[PDB]
Amino acid sequence: IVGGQEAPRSKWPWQVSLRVHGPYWMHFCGGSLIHPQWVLTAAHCVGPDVKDLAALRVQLREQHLYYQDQLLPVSRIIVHPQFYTAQIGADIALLELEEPVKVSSHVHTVTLPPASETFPPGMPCWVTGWGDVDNDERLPPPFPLKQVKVPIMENHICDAKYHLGAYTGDDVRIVRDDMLCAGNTRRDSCQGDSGGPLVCKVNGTWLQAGVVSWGEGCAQPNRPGIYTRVTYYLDWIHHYVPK
Amino acid sequence: IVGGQEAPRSKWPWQVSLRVHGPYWMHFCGGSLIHPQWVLTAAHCVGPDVKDLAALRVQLREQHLYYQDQLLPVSRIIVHPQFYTAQIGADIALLELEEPVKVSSHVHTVTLPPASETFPPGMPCWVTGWGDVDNDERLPPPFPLKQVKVPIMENHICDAKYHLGAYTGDDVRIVRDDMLCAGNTRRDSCQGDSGGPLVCKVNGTWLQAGVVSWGEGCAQPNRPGIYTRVTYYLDWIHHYVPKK
Amino acid sequence: IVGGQEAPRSKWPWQVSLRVHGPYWMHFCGGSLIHPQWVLTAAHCVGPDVKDLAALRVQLREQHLYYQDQLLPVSRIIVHPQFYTAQIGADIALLELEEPVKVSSHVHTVTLPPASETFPPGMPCWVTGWGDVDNDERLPPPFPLKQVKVPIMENHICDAKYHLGAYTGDDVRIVRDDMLCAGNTRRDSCQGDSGGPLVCKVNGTWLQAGVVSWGEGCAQPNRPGIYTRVTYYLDWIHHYVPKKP
Amino acid sequence: IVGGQEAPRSKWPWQVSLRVHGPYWMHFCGGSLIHPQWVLTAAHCVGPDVKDLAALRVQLREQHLYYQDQLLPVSRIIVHPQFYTAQIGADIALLELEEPVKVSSHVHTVTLPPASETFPPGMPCWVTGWGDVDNDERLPPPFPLKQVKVPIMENHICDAKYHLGAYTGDDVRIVRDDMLCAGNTRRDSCQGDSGGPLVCKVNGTWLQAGVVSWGEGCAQPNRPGIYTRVTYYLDWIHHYVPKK
């Protein structure tokens, strides 16, 4: 997270850390708990190439990475079959846990928006994770969960920004209809925040608008964060995840 | 180049090295001379973001990188307006030199194919450059230009191989119609060969079939090298580059 | 620490972490609390060149590096005036804290040995720190304090081992009289353990025998860990550090 | 070499490059040809731990590293038996070549000074090599042999400089009597120049005053280059190397 602060302990009870087997169980991507037995993440975190399930674990919300680890095994990785790269799109995956989690005030699910929900430009949303604090600048120990308020921006405006200082023809889409855009040169997601949630508070309810997907670096001029648009893939999510 | 040998001095007179300004004028991509004033390369080497022309130079064919440098400034970078990433496609760009080069037996242009040429499997094709000799393994000094004969494979076969060990749906095309596929687990292009030529000898004439574009690593199982198909972009090239 | 275990919370209440200012307050060396206001470390951690005191802080015993940091500023760095390199010797330094710390069962001073104590082979000795777990292999998060029991070896035996597979003449001493030797191919200190304590339990009392100084890599054949011999430098320590009241 | 220039092709015909076996025969240290069959170098380049002779080669003077290599095998490494570290001293070694070299105007031996020779402070001397051009800055391709003029400085003055901004007691020797000192914040030897020669022209003859040994970085304030004093070890050298 670029230009963020440490999250209060009470905030973002749905944030999860994805861990890969090595010298230690290292954080590589974020996720959100959308159901007691399901994590929503980015496809690029776990694909497009098939990964060994034995080398993957989920860690539920912890204030500091690695200090109080209770690693959960994954029974199934479901990557959207249309996914190959984040820039093409369908950058969305589901992790099925071997067990449902026992939910509490400190650990519980995020609400998905209805299909009709159109998060208007300028709406204050929050992105959370344990990713880099700037370009090629890792989160220092003790690795606090960070948060940043980012304004949602119209897809057409974000597409136009990605064309400034680029050879790509103005009529050739960079930011596609299954993508959502947020952030500026002070406030953005970064490497290691991938798969984590963009959440917006609507009528007293936190709704997951986005999954951290891609961008040209972090908080670069005219290069806002690109997110998978959750409303676009609700039918695909609901094919696997109970309502 | 993976599984190659050092090129003989007489071979590949169209091979060029692209150089970026830093502590020294460092090789980052290959290219081909297609006209005395024009270099064909990959868009991903010079884009999609607009870069300072003053920090780019072209080096014509040398047997050993850096030893006999005569660096040429660039007047113009022209990147295909459809290009954003190599995997989406249109991975093709043109460099206009500030001056036309004097051609010779040792330094001269490659011939572009006619639109009808498909380059079927079994055709003898070669890829050349100063790129890595394996995954994360740089070409050692004194940096000889390498060559390797790569077997062309049909786009549908290569598309099917890219789906093996992948979550991507079988009917979601990975290897696109503007791309060409070549190489195996012994013979491939690698990092630093990007933008360089894939050339096939057809009726005694060398034709540039491909621009080194992308792949999953180098010489990996079921992951052959992907090249921009030059025949697909001839009309765009001919918009900028004069006929002989 | 090579071939160690995580230290129990009750052990090594004198272990300190030295921190350098950067993107964060990063661990670079170990140390020992020998007085409420004084830390014993290796000279090579803080010298031979004079460094900015404002860029150095001390962290008292923590079970996991960085998790519960209460960083203490330093008023004075005192490096042995004979020190230039660890291999020449006098690899010993003192940090004066700006304030005396409040001691407890969990955080308190280590006892220095009497001048007469030689620490012979067979004596049970432990080395502790947050250093590498092997050659070029960092301690993983969450960075637990590690301990390992190291066999002390006689200086003459260790000197002879350092000459095996070396061009250095047998009568040219490598392991010097102000140094102490401990460890084997399974048990050793490593990069990041430097300045930390080697402690031996003598008649029910923990005594600091050594300061982690140097070696050829970590846990390598015929290359045991070299430590500054504390007994050699007691008079220099007692020049600066007041005796217990 | 820091603050240097590329050597003219006619200069320093005694300069050699030491090569270690890896992906390629990589330069790690310099040396000087003091006899047709003997190279003088720094002990720290080849010790104190015993190295495999099969993994070591010598390359005689070349203008550009790696481009025209003719690698020579070594029959014997002789490291001074007093050597353990450069800071303690005796940082001097001899390589015996398997064959004597055929000498020419372009490749021939440097003259060693007489025991009586005292190179006075301020004397213009030259250090040569393929080492770093600054702190953590490698010599760029095509790796030209570099030279820099450095004034010799009195051991007592150089010892005093190493004590400025240091905790070391002023009466505790850093720069020892078997060492020689040269260079400033613009002009110095660096990593990769180790074992190479410091040469001074005395009565029309180039004499090797020093072997590149150690220092605190390259061209740092009050930290001039430290060299092994050749006059100190003449008797040891002449124990193995036949006199001219």
Author numbering:
A (entry chain C): 16 to 258
B (entry chain B), D (entry chain A): 16 to 259
C (entry chain D): 16 to 260
Q: What do the paper's sentences say?
A:
Among these proteases, tryptase, a tetrameric serine protease, is one of the most abundant and functionally significant enzymes in mast cell granules. Tryptase is implicated in extracellular matrix (ECM) remodeling and inflammatory diseases, including asthma, chronic pain, fibrosis, and cancer progression. Due to its central role in mast cell-mediated responses, tryptase inhibition has emerged as a promising therapeutic strategy for conditions linked to excessive mast cell activation.
Additionally, we solved the 2.06 Å X-ray crystal structures of human Tryptase beta-2 (hTPSB2), in both its apo form and in complex with compound #1, experimentally confirming the binding mode and the key molecular interactions predicted by docking studies for this compound. In order to explore and validate these binding modes through molecular docking, we generated X-ray crystal structures of human tryptase beta-2 (hTPSB2) in its apo form. The structure was solved at a resolution of 2.06 Å and displayed the typical trypsin-like serine protease fold. It forms a homotetramer, with the catalytic sites facing toward the central channel.
